[PDB]
Amino acid sequence: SKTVLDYTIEFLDKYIPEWFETGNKCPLFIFFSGPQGSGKSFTSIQIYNHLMEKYGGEKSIGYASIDDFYLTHEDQLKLNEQFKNNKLLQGRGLPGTHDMKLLQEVLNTIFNQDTVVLPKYDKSQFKGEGDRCPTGQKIKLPVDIFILEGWFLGFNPILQGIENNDLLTGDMVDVNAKLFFYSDLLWRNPEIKSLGIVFTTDNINNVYGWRLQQEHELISKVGKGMTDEQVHAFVDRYMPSYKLYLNDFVRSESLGSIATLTLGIDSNRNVYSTKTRCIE
């Protein structure tokens, strides 16, 4: 049976060459989006390698996880107080906890030396609170293909009647405002041409399961991790976002400006359905 990888490679091996046949010198972005635990991270990494091997020296390939752009430990502390009463913004995690100014600059440089520098993060820092690495990564300019991945890529801010939406309340109000900067800068940015890989599942509560598994394995290995109660508390921080944006995002099939591949997977990460939308 075909895995998510099989479908993804199939989709990209058709569309990437078709993009190059256009002669476009601007970068081609490739966005990977999927709930935490869906395996989208591993899949994006596999594609990175796939492209590195296929095009190797004839094309410049870049890769980054949106979390590579988390705020410096210090700035997150600043963010904590700034939104002292918003529990969703305390600590790295939700939209608004990333360094947008830095992302803005990188994008600027890309669409502009011989290399551009992207940040790298270290989550083990400050007893697990995390901090930015003293040294990131360097990508050769111009960039031909740029792979970016995150669990909320493609989500769009609620723009109208934000006081009537029941899901959009409390701490989510600021999160929604924060989400704007990513959307505006990336998947809603008219200058960005891209292919999208979307992972969705039959039940969103699969996310709890997937993280409960991950943590149980860590504990059985080093006797340290969150209690199930804490794992629930952890995931609960992301559920509001899922409930608010996942539907429009996935149903819209437009993470990619050129084409989008949507994959539906079950608890065992098994594919039950596939769909490719090529923006008409």
Curated annotation (Swiss-Prot):
Binding site for ATP: 34-41
Superkingdom assignment: Eukaryota
SUPFAM superfamilies: P-loop containing nucleoside triphosphate hydrolases (SSF52540)
Disruption phenotype: Leads to cell death when overexpressing the camptothecin mimetic TOP1-T(722)A mutant.
Keyword Lipid metabolism appears in the UniProt entry: no
Primary site of residence: cytoplasm
GO MF term list: ATP binding; kinase activity
Enzyme class name: transferase
Record keyword Nuclease present: no
Similarity section: Belongs to the GLYK kinase family.
Function in brief: ATP-dependent kinase whose specificity is not yet known.
Any further remark recorded for this protein: Present with 4280 molecules/cell in log phase SD medium.
Record protein name field: Probable ATP-dependent kinase TDA10
